[PDB]
Design a protein around this nucleic acid. Structure first.
Lengths: 22, 59, 236, 56, 106
RNA sequence: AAGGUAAGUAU
RNA sequence: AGCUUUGCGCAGUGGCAGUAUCGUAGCCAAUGAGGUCUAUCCGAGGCGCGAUUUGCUAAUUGAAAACUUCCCAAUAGCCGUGACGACUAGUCGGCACUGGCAAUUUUUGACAGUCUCGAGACUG
């Protein structure tokens, strides 16, 4: 039983796109 | 799970959450303090009176 | 030991007033898990001032208690400060608030600190503790002689507990070979492994004789498990 | 945030904006969605999960 | 990694200016802050693309007496909007960092 | 009627 | 020449350093500051005002505790099979793989631990 690292979305200070990246 | 895989405290988990959210982590000095604290914790987990006893053996 | 720091030698006179002058500032601190002991030696006048109540001495001792932890490294500082003095534990716990990482837990088991007063070598060290500077108190050579460090304290406590009950009988009970094994690296002498236990059996019998005479249970009726707890002062 | 208040109460308003400072609502939403995604991915065998993702 | 800082190392008395507005901080503001006759430094950390300053700048003077005078001369008073803060520059170079790491043993 | 405009930042 | 008395500044230790102390560009002085003592009197300032250097470093909270680049798409052998050439249905040398390569002689490991004076012994 193991858990791979958990990723997250960088909504703040992100000018790449209006919507949060997926 | 962090890089070392140890079970993080909820405060550290929220710190990672916010660092990912804003897209940037702590500063250089904060990172140095964090790695110093991690090194101190690792050294404490691995464990000076023998040297004191040897010195006190001599009059 | 809070009483050790506040201990004051009292003179004896048929007509003159007893001179309950302070002895020293050392608290007879010990740390069997650390393989050594702490001797916070302070001046007798500094230990107890003129017209100083017991509460005033306890308040000053708390500052010195925190000072010893402050000087020591955080890792080297005791993670749990097990002091049987519950009344003095709270000021120590209040002093422990200066170190949030460290914790203070009540000590149901009471270390027989009276052995240091009973022992002439440590009794002379009590007089030698009159220096205001902190001193170094090495661990007993019996603990080093014993193979098991976990049982090293038990062997030392068993002799110490009998000394508190009867110091003169403890010296006779203690084997002279173990008694005359003092090393320059230890305040207290060494132990001859199993042979010391046979000598300590007489010291245990000294407590058993006290248990047999005072308590209704006979000397043999005193169980070793209870005696070991009594040696460590587990009972209140 | 997603707290609805009826009538301006300066004490409650300031207390709420202190408690929910630094986008705390978005943070807890992201935490719960990430926890759900991780839980679903861990037990993806019995659930016959081919893809478990989140929209933009 | 900062060759310009090496050229700026000539003036020893270096002060760290903080709490700078992005548009408030400017070369003219530094010139107005250049009360002492010694040469100043208007360099302030800023974004690579947009140029938005992070609020931290460094002013270098060759006169430590002027350093001490300006430490209390311009504490809290600044021409622009954001009030200025002054701190003793604890700046270190890589050689100093290596020396400190070596000497950290004792 | 109301006593319920967050400010800040350049466009 | 040694030694001693004493003070200043400087050097060192110790000590106190919120009934602890200086600052004053204010204000009253040994011709006399200021007494409730001692008013042929003591003799020091009186009592206001202004307040309690600089440097090292840790620790805590916070998303961030301020020292001069992000991110994106990708990156920097064998066994047989079909043709080609050569030597007497077979063999050889080069080409690509439409299938395989964890079951005793080679590549999916009979390996690991302990002891003695480069060598040997014991166990799983």
């Amino acid at each position: 039983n193991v858990s791979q690292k958990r990723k997250y979305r960088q909504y703040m200070n992100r000018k790449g796109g209006f919507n949060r990246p997926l | 799970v962090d890089e070392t895989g140890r079970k993080l405290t909820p405060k550290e988990a929220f710190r990672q959450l916010s660092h990912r959210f804003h897209g940037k982590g702590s500063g250089k000095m904060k990172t140095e303090r964090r790695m110093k604290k991690l090194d101190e914790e690792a050294l404490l987990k691995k464990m000076l009176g023998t040297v004191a006893l040897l010195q006190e053996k001599q009059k | 030991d809070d009483t050790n720091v506040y201990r004051v030698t009292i003179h004896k006179t048929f007509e003159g007033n007893l001179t309950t002058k302070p002895i020293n500032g050392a608290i007879f601190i010990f740390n069997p898990r650390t393989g050594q002991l702490f001797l916070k030696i302070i001046h007798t006048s500094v230990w107890a001032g003129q017209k100083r109540l017991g509460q005033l001495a306890k308040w000053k001792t708390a500052e010195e208690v925190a000072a010893l932890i402050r000087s020591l490294p955080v890792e080297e500082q005791p993670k749990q400060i097990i002091v049987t003095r519950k009344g003095m534990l709270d000021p120590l716990e209040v002093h422990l608030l200066d170190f949030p990482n460290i914790v203070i837990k009540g000590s149901e088991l009471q270390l027989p600190f009276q052995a240091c007063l009973k022992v002439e070598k440590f009794g002379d060290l009590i007089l030698k503790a009159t220096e205001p500077q902190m001193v170094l108190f090495n661990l007993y050579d019996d603990w080093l002689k014993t193979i098991s460090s976990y049982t090293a304290f038990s062997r030392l406590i068993l002799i110490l507990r009998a000394l508190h009950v009867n110091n003169d009988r403890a010296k006779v009970i203690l084997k002279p070979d173990k008694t005359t094994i003092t090393e320059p690296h230890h305040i207290w002498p060494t132990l001859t492994d199993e042979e010391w236990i046979k000598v300590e059996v007489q010291l245990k019998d000294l407590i058993l004789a006290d248990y047999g005479k005072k308590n209704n249970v006979n000397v043999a009726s005193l169980t070793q498990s209870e005696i070991r707890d009594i040696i460590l002062g587990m009972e209140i | 945030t997603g707290i609805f208040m009826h009538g301006k109460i300066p004490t409650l308003k300031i207390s709420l904006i202190q408690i929910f400072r630094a986008h705390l609502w978005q943070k807890i939403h992201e935490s719960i969605v990430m926890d759900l995604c991780q839980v679903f991915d861990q037990e993806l065998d019995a659930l016959e999960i081919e893809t478990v993702q989140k929209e933009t | 990694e900062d060759p310009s800082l090496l050229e700026w190392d000539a003036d020893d008395f270096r002060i760290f200016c903080g709490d700078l507005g992005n548009e408030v901080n400017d070369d003219i503001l530094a010139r107005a802050f250049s009360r002492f006759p010694s040469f100043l430094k208007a360099k302030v950390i800023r974004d690579k693309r947009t140029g938005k300053t992070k609020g931290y700048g460094f002013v270098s003077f060759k006169d430590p007496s002027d350093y001490v005078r300006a430490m209390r001369e311009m504490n809290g008073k600044y021409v622009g909007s954001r009030p200025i803060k002054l701190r003793k520059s604890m700046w270190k170079d890589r050689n100093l960092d290596v020396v400190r790491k070596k000497q950290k043993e004792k």
